[PDB]
């Protein structure tokens, strides 16, 4: 409806999907749809992935096929979040508006709010969000890094 | 705090306090004083009027007035100042808390009780009040159920015979001669030595001379002959400016007016005859006991020798077998007070007070049914 995938883009998505398909059955695990999408650098939420899986886990077998993966890819590609939007989302958590947030307050907003980061995801984030060792993140440079 | 107030609204002295006291807490002249002269010092705190001891202290700049004359209240706007001063300045009470016992003479105008009653309930908001008769209260102070009371105030002399707690209201006698008439006559007779007293302030100086120097002669014509023939009866008095008065027969001429009212030009019989005529107007079976119980009260009975002359004169009027006694207690100036503190403490008399409920039901005519 709103946008349509090109045959070359479908082939690039099939090439990336092939690493998770591996044996050639043409299908990925229901816990693994987010992994194959994030391998292409997409930003799906866990609530979006639950709303996706609810329409394709219709008869079990723990898995989803390439046609329904490509359909759910074409659903997410309509209105993806921007560099300016993720930079402004940190700017709303910034208490002073000066461009810096503390590692302790980042750990708070990543784990007291919904869709929580795991301790693996937080400590490896903080390890490079602490850019020059003062315990604060320059979130504008961190978004210029994270959007690569 | 709900103790009964008692006011003896005498003609010349307010005497006021609480029931169950032995003596009045407030005793002050029943006068209002208004400035006679031009107020010249600015910021002085001068007043439209002064009351009681304030007026008696400032006399030389004031016209003094008594709102009561002959035991009748003649100036209600000033009598309200005296009652307001009694409660608010002298006793330091709210009258709205205390049932108030008032006094008056017998044979008074009915409008005097009604207007006392109205002022107490509509101006002073008392919870209850009563109007007792002065000479009846004077038997309570004596501890007697029987006797004839001579009460002599500043305005009125009255005789009330009582037998076993029953007054004989037809035998009550009233004589509108008392201590103010004796003061106005002492002002007349003092001009014979050339001492002129004429202002309402000088009337208080002549009152103080009358109180300190006068006495009642046991035989007036013998004391007149004693004064005509010696200086032995003469006494000096020093006036407020240090001038020294001396008086002689004027010391017993003034009090003798009670025994001879013709010195004022009055036709009436003297206080001895008025007592005997009041006894003789009673029933024969009660007279023996009345003669043995002549109770004298009020400040005009305070003269030296008056209980001796009054006994002598009644003994000559009454039968030679009768046992005439005169009760002249040292406190007799306060027997109407002491009687009012007794007849306000009594438990059997707490039903007698006119309540504001009964005054609201009946209007001011309630005193004629209750008192």
């Amino acid at each position: 409806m709103a946008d349509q995938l090109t045959e070359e883009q479908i082939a690039e998505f099939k090439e990336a999907f092939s690493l998770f398909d591996k044996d050639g059955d043409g299908t990925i695990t229901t816990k693994e749809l987010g992994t194959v999408m994030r391998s292409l650098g997409q930003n799906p939420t866990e609530a979006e992935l639950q709303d996706m899986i609810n329409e394709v886990d219709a008869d079990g077998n723990g898995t989803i096929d390439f046609p329904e993966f490509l359909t759910m890819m074409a659903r997410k590609m309509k209105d993806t979040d921007s560099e300016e939007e993720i930079r402004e989302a940190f700017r709303v958590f910034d208490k002073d508006g000066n461009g810096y947030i503390s590692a302790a307050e980042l750990r708070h907003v990543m784990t007291n709010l919904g869709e929580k980061l795991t301790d693996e995801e937080v400590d490896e984030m903080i390890r490079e969000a602490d850019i020059d060792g003062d315990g604060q993140v320059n979130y504008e440079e961190f978004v210029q890094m994270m959007t690569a | 705090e709900t103790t009964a107030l008692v006011c003896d609204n005498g003609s010349g002295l307010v005497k006021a306090g609480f029931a169950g006291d032995d003596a009045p807490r407030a005793v002050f002249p029943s006068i209002v004083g208004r400035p006679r002269h031009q107020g010249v010092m600015v910021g002085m705190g001068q007043k439209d009027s002064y009351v009681g001891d304030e007026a008696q202290s400032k006399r030389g700049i004031l016209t003094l007035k008594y709102p009561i004359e002959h035991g009748i209240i003649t100036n209600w706007d000033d009598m309200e100042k005296i009652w307001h001063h009694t409660f608010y300045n002298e006793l330091r009470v709210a009258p709205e808390e205390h049932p108030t016992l008032l006094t008056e003479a017998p044979l008074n105008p009915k409008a005097n009780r009604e207007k006392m009653t109205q002022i107490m309930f509509e101006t002073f908001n008392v919870p209850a009040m009563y109007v007792a008769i002065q000479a009846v209260l004077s038997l309570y102070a004596s501890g007697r159920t029987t006797g004839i009371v001579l009460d002599s105030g500043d305005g009125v002399t009255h005789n009330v015979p009582i037998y076993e707690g029953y007054a004989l209201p037809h035998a009550i006698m009233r004589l509108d001669l008392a201590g103010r008439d004796l003061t106005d006559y002492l002002m007349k007779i003092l001009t014979e030595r050339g001492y002129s007293f004429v202002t309402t302030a000088e009337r208080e100086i002549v009152r103080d001379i009358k109180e300190k120097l006068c006495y009642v002669a046991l035989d007036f014509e013998n004391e007149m002959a004693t004064a005509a023939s010696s200086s032995s009866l003469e006494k000096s008095y020093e006036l407020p400016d240090g001038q020294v008065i001396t008086i002689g027969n004027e010391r017993f001429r003034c009090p003798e007016t009670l025994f001879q009212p013709s010195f004022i030009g009055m036709e009436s019989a003297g206080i001895h005859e008025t007592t005997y005529n009041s006894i003789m107007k009673c029933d024969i079976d009660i007279r023996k006991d009345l003669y043995a119980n002549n109770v004298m009260s009020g400040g005009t009975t305070m003269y030296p020798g008056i209980a001796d002359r009054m006994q002598k004169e009644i003994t000559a009027l009454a039968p030679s077998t009768m046992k005439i006694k005169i009760i002249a207690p040292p406190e007799r100036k306060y027997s109407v007070w002491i009687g009012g503190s007794i007849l306000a403490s009594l438990s059997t008399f707490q039903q007698m007070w006119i309540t504001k409920q009964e005054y609201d039901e009946a209007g001011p005519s309630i005193v004629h049914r209750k008192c």
Partner: protein, 709 residues
């Protein structure tokens, strides 16, 4: 609980104000605002809130952004002194023991540690604070309410240059309660120095002065019958006080001159007058004059004469006219009040000249600006109130008048500047009760000034009778005469009631004439400016004898000096700190609501809240409001392409505000009910879930490509 009281939903409720104080204080949040004003409740604890990490947190951000702290007011007033370059005051107010001296020390610690010349700033702090035992000894006293209440308004500048570096300071003292020198109420002492000298003094020190250590030996120490009390250690306090004079550069001979003034004041109160056969006063006792001629350094024949004669000068002839016993007692007491308040003015000058700039501070020098702290006595209600409470409570009335005027003016001029129609607030008009005290020929002070002046036997009860006659129909005045029978139970004869902003206060008139007389005749001043004592020769000056007026009464001098403190405070930019003592036991954690209700009322915090709230709870420039709340309205997110005003105008439709809940000014949005603001910050709290969700999804879409492939 709510940080700024203008966000309180039922802002008209004293119980909802005191409940939010209790809720914050239970939570250890000892500070709150009321617009620009700060409320502080004493923690009775060394809370770590004053440490360096909080100074660097609060330096650079205003009262309208960072959460309540003393250092939010401190920053706000300092950056005004850098930005507007108008001079500043902070007023510290509330009860003795409410933390006013701790607030004063921590404001001077912030202005030492956070400013660009910390060695000179720390020196001016130490010279301001090491002067405290001396000022407290000469200027605090025990009252019925506290063992160490300040009885003067104490002003303390730190003086800054064009660079924002402290070059110096100042001390100024206002409105010292000098009626205390010669008279005290029951349960109150004189100023602390006398009892400290008698109990703490050395043998030669006492022996050279009047030497009897028992304080009941002196009439001016014992009128309040309170000399010994177990809470005060006068011996120990004098050993700290005497060292403060040494540390504040009083040379030993200046301290001996100064002790000689303190002992002269003790001896003056022991002078007894007998009458001549003409009712003129004569000094009976040579034994006080034997010392006063040494300790004041004046000739005894001259002092005998000055204590007992008034001098007129007319056509160049000078005429000694004798005093009656009442005038000679008032002349002895006027000299003691004058000699004591002048040696205190001299102490403050001698301290203040040690704070002055060492560099020339004079043209072509660039600029200089002062930041002040004013600490003046709070409102005062006791078991019995009298002439000094009347003066203190008039002072506080006149400061509440200034404060509510400036608060109301500040809200009106904002609504006019932003183009909002001023929704009318009706508030207790302090003007009416100041006019009752001070109006030139009909106020209480003028009626009292007449009663001390007018001829005849004037008395305290005659002064009350004249108030009853001349104030008569006024709505904020009452007496037992003017009272109805119901209120006449509560209010005695010989008392008047004023309705103040802090409620009704009842003053007993006894001693109003004795305390208001200040008969310092030119003969006493001429005697004292001839003194051999180096202090007294600086305190009384030959130019003061050129004044031909009669002696002004204490209430007149107090009115004039208070009007001068008010015109000083209108000239400066004022900030305000208002201090609450949370119980009378000096106890941590305990919130004594009955005592806090009195303080919240005495401080006038409900009238402040009312006048500050006015039409709308909250307002903010659209530039700041839109950046906070645009995330709720996708058409404005992450950036709005139009004007901020139009971005807010679509956002308040998206949030669903009703047309009566908000208004739009020239640059500020106004929000009427704090219901709307809280429902918006709560909508933002549930929207932070989406903002974190977006960051977590963006992180997982990057982090997966870091740990794999």
């Amino acid at each position: 609980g709510v940080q700024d009281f203008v966000l309180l939903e039922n802002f008209t409720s004293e119980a909802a104000f005191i409940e939010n104080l209790r809720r914050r204080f239970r939570e250890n949040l000892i500070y709150t605002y009321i617009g620009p004003v700060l409320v502080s409740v004493n923690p009775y604890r060394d809370l770590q809130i004053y440490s360096r990490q909080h100074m660097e947190r609060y330096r650079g951000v205003s009262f309208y952004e960072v959460p309540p702290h003393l250092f939010a007011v401190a920053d706000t007033v300092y950056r005004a002194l850098r930005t507007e370059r108008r001079d500043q005051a902070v007023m510290i107010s509330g009860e003795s023991g409410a933390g006013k001296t701790e607030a004063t020390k921590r404001l001077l610690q912030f202005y030492a540690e956070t400013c660009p010349a910390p060695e000179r700033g720390g020196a001016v702090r130490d010279r301001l604070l090491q002067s405290n035992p001396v000022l407290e000894a000469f200027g605090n006293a025990k009252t019925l309410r506290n063992d160490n209440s300040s009885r003067f308004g104490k002003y303390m500048d730190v003086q800054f240059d064009f660079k924002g570096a402290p070059v110096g300071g100042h001390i100024l003292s206002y409105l010292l309660e000098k009626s205390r020198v010669v008279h005290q109420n029951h349960g109150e002492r004189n100023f602390h120095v006398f009892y400290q000298l008698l109990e703490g003094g050395e043998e030669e020190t006492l022996r050279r002065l009047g030497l009897e250590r028992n304080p009941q030996s002196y009439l001016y120490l014992v009128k309040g019958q309170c000399a010994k009390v177990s809470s005060i250690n006068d011996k120990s306090d004098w050993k700290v006080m005497r060292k403060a004079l040494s540390v504040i550069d009083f040379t030993e001979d200046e301290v001996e001159d100064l002790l000689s003034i303190v002992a002269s004041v003790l001896h003056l109160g022991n002078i007894h007058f007998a009458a001549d056969e003409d009712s003129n006063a004569q000094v009976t006792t040579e034994n006080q004059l034997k010392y006063l001629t040494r300790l004041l350094g004046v000739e005894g024949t001259t002092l005998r004469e000055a204590l007992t004669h008034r001098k007129i000068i007319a056509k160049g002839e000078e005429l000694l006219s004798p005093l009656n016993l009442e005038q000679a007692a008032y002349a002895r007491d006027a000299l003691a009040k004058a000699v004591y308040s002048r040696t205190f003015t001299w102490l403050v000058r001698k301290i203040n000249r040690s704070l002055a700039s060492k560099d020339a501070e004079s043209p072509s020098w660039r600029s200089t600006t002062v930041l002040g702290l004013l600490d003046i006595y709070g409102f005062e209600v006791f078991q019995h109130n009298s002439f000094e409470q009347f003066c203190i409570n008039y002072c506080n009335e006149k400061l509440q008048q200034l404060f509510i005027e400036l608060t109301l003016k500040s809200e009106q001029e904002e609504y006019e500047a932003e183009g909002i129609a001023w929704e009318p607030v009706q508030y207790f008009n302090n003007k009416i009760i100041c006019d009752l005290v001070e109006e030139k020929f009909k106020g209480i002070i003028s009626i009292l000034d007449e009663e001390c002046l007018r001829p005849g036997e004037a008395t305290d009860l005659t002064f009350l009778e004249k108030l009853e006659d001349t104030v008569k129909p006024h709505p904020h005045f009452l007496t037992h005469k003017l009272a109805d029978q119901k209120t006449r139970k509560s209010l005695d004869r010989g008392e008047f009631r004023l309705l103040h902003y802090a409620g009704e206060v009842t003053y007993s008139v006894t001693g109003f004439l004795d305390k208001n007389n200040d008969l310092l005749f030119r003969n006493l001043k001429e005697t004292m400016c001839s003194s051999m004592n180096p202090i007294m020769a600086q305190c009384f000056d030959k130019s003061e004898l050129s004044d031909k007026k009669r002696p002004e009464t204490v209430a007149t001098q107090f009115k004039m000096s208070l009007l001068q403190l008010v015109e000083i405070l209108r000239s400066k930019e004022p900030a305000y700190i208002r201090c609450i003592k949370p119980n009378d036991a000096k106890q941590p954690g305990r919130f004594d609501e009955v005592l806090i209700r009195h303080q919240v009322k005495y401080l006038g915090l409900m009238e402040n809240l009312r006048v500050r709230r006015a039409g709308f709870a909250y307002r903010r420039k659209y530039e700041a409001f839109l950046q906070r709340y645009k995330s709720l309205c996708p058409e404005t997110w992450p950036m709005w392409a139009g004007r901020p005003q139009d971005g807010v105008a679509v956002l308040v439709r998206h949030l669903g505000y009703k047309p009566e809940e908000y208004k739009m000014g020239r640059t500020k949005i106004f929000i009427r009910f704090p219901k709307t603001l809280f429902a918006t910050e709560d909508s933002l709290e549930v929207r932070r879930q989406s903002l974190a969700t977006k960051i977590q999804a963006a992180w997982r879409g990057f982090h997966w490509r870091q740990k794999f492939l």
